[PDB]
Write a protein that binds this DNA or RNA. Structure first.
Lengths: 82, 97, 108, 92, 92, 108, 82, 97
DNA sequence: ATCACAATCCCGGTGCCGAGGCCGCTCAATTGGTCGTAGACAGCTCTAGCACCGCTTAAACGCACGTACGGATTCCGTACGTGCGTTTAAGCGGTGCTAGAGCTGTCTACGACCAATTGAGCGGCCTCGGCACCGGGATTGTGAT
DNA sequence: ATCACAATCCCGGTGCCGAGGCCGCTCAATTGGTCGTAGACAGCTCTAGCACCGCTTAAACGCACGTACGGAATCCGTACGTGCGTTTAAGCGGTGCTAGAGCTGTCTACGACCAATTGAGCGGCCTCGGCACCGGGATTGTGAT
């Protein structure tokens, strides 16, 4: 049973993500708030993807399930990741 | 000798906006995804491409959110982003808040 | 029988009119599909593809590159107004972002 | 035996940039783009047929969907290209 | 000879609040709501059928589409209602 | 031949199963429609209708009125978190808005 | 031929709309900006509505054309404005 | 005797958030709609319900925009909405800016 | 304006693995013919959209005036950014094991189709009941006194 | 703290038009029989997901230090809100005209369907060349002076 993996989203990673966003100075309370925002986004996408997987009677979440779930959220993605 | 605060930040901004690689480490993100998914169904399997796709989408979402948050912080005549900036950006976007 | 000709060559297209017709028929879009609809659709799809590849090839050449990568597609889409409007809600995998620093954050 | 648009996208690429290649990930992006635009146009045309109580999707419905979906000059040039292709096809 | 859910909405109103009326503007709102939810559920069920290469929309597709479209408590109660109605219908 | 019985009465519903089946069949949704799909869909639509009407009638009764008007529907939707999430991109004609003044603007 | 009807959206009307939105104090330059925003929104909606009308070979814009055009913008409307 | 600045404004806020009627006058809005539509097609006719629907949607859109703008102005620690507040709210919403 | 030096750009010089070409064949596109019906087109009726006008009165407009708010300035305390030595764990490559994804074949229950029956829903007509309005009175809420 | 008096809630009392009930009919829903195939299920292969592990070394972490920034307080000047008299034009009701919406009937051209033919594309293998990286060297960007 995995637990408390949200701390694997480290402060340096959040700083890199903010730098790609153009941020110059980051308050100390941003990291926990970002962790919450990311958790909510992932919960909604993963719930939809698992629904798509269970409808197909599969046990394995495929990339296409994730792509369809992102299309539900209005987050259309072109291509794939690794 | 020592760089003034903000010079290294501006260099980093230039560097990370030039590049396209993933900014979150793969193993911690995959553990996070599996931990979140166990609450919906036990003993799920994942294609590797599935987790990769999730990471790409998540990082794009966070970068767009940080851009909007930066706009709000500048609107308040600040150069530091704060949790209230994120709250305002997410409220205007229509998110759950 | 006459020598067979693809409908794409009759219409002077590179995109496949027959496959577009088959996708229209099997996609639960309508009960019947007219003859000119797949031709028109293939023409429009080819035009949009040509626009994007032209812009992306220009972006690749500006970096002294020969092959188009996802970054060049992202730069082409975000730097062109109409494409940016059409593809507004779309994420390009490994596209990155446009370089953009707000002026108030620059020194002096 | 999955079907994709890589061979036609490559043909169009060699028509616009003879000396330029493309990587397989950019080609996957292009395939996703073509599939997305197809879904959008076909869905709008199906809506147009349903609103007017028509059972057939013709080139008129495709043209109206193109005008509804594409912005500005893209719509004008796409309509021109589609009309030219249909005219050439009808005379064949 | 237009089609509306007005009489059925009125029947449901008489069960839920027996002494309460409804204005014709509010009945139009209700008709729009019923039609919008119908189109959402049917389209998501159609996408579910097409994704899995199926040709029939069954109660399984409807249940999955409801789980996709309805949030939280609403989805669970609607699924309960749909299952109960199907079970009562099958025993008839 | 037995006396006709509606599929709604067999399923114990007020919403019309036959009309829902006809709408599913003619909407270009799928090639075939299962027997239980219209029954399930009608049950779900009826439940959502009942949920909204209950909240709107509560609001109307709180306003000392016996008729439901679009303002009552708007109040009911915007005050229920689930319905507000479901109907969040929807404009209700003559619905008005929820009374809300920011605390910083209040006196003294 | 109609000309310069955007000024028919008067300053007090914009003030009423701001009051329904909970606005307490309004800058003097807000009225022209609001007129520009309204003109853009109306242009998009009306262009789509006229496209729907023309496809039907009609000369009259119906309320159903407007409801479809608003549904295209992602602005679903229940009922009719009358 | 006269009311302090803002008392009448707060009364107006309570009154207009209580009501549901249209806040723009019907004839000027109809003239505006016809003037806009004449650019896309000449000699266009309109059903009355079409113009009514357009006004309902437009007023709802403007009221929602003013809510978001008021949030932006409060975020800047002002109480006066300014054009930059509208610009920020529209940019974050993804509108044509 | 000078000076140190870290960061950045420039010019080859390879390796390597993926972009792109070649080929056999199979399965989807094409050709030709027959048939039914979708819809193009004409013609007709009658609705509802547009034009216009005169009165009334609510709304808009212009102006005076004052003060509440926005913006600039200053000051200070600490929360941030930067640098560096130490610890952590990600990434990689290899191995083993097995769950389950993808496929193929059988067969049967289910859904389409069609003809006949029939009753539910809709349009029009009608009559009262809910609700907005009005006036007289009490409640309460704001700003100077 | 008090008071005038303006905004607001109470309590009834006629109107008035829209809600909701009622009835005949027609057209969509139901029932029963037949049949073709979609999909449910079984069985099998072998792909790819998971677990584990040891080494390397890049990233993360914790801490020190200083200064740049956020936040608070002050001040001023002018652009807002409020009130009042005058002007404007929206709203309403009525009249008239006609464009075009909606419907119906006819017919014919177009699209479905089917059987045979064939060539386009797909998967698999193979090979060179585009680009990533490294190292040496010149430029420049940044901080103290």
């Amino acid at each position: 049973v995995l637990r408390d993996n949200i701390q694997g989203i480290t402060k340096p990673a959040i700083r890199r993500l903010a730098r790609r966003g153009g941020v110059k100075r980051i308050s100390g309370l941003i990291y926990e708030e970002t962790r919450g925002v990311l958790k909510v986004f992932l919960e909604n996408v993963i719930r939809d993807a698992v629904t798509y997987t269970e409808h197909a009677k599969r046990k394995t979440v495929t990339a296409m399930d994730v792509v369809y779930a992102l299309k539900r959220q209005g987050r259309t993605l072109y291509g794939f990741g690794g | 000798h020592r760089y003034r605060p903000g010079t290294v930040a501006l260099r980093e901004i230039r560097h990370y906006q030039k590049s396209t690689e993933l900014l979150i480490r793969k193993l911690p993100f995959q553990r996070l995804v599996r931990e979140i998914a166990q609450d919906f169904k036990t003993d799920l399997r994942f294609q590797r491409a599935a987790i990769g796709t999730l990471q790409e989408a998540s990082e794009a979402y966070l970068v767009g959110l940080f851009e909007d948050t930066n706009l709000c912080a500048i609107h308040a005549t600040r150069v530091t982003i704060m949790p209230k900036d994120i709250q305002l950006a997410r409220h205007i976007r229509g998110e759950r808040v | 029988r006459a020598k067979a000709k693809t409908r794409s060559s009759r219409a002077g297209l590179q995109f496949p009119v027959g496959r577009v017709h088959r996708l229209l028929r099997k996609g639960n879009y309508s009960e019947r599909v007219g003859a000119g609809a797949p031709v028109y659709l293939a023409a429009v799809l080819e035009y949009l593809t040509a626009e994007i590849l032209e812009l992306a090839g220009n972006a690749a050449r500006d970096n002294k590159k020969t092959r188009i990568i996802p970054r060049h597609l992202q730069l082409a889409i975000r730097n062109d107004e109409e494409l940016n409007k059409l593809l507004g809600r779309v994420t390009i995998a490994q596209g990155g972002v446009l370089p953009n620093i707000q002026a108030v954050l620059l020194p002096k | 035996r999955k079907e994709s648009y890589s061979i036609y996208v490559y043909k169009v690429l060699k028509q616009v940039h003879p000396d330029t290649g493309i990587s397989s990930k950019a080609m996957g992006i292009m395939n996703s783009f073509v599939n997305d635009i197809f879904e959008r146009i076909a869905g709008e045309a199906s809506r147009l047929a349903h609103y007017n109580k028509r059972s057939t999707i013709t080139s008129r419905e495709i043209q109206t969907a193109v005008r509804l979906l594409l912005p500005g000059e893209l719509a004008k040039h796409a309509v021109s290209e589609g009309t030219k292709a249909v005219t050439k096809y009808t005379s064949a």
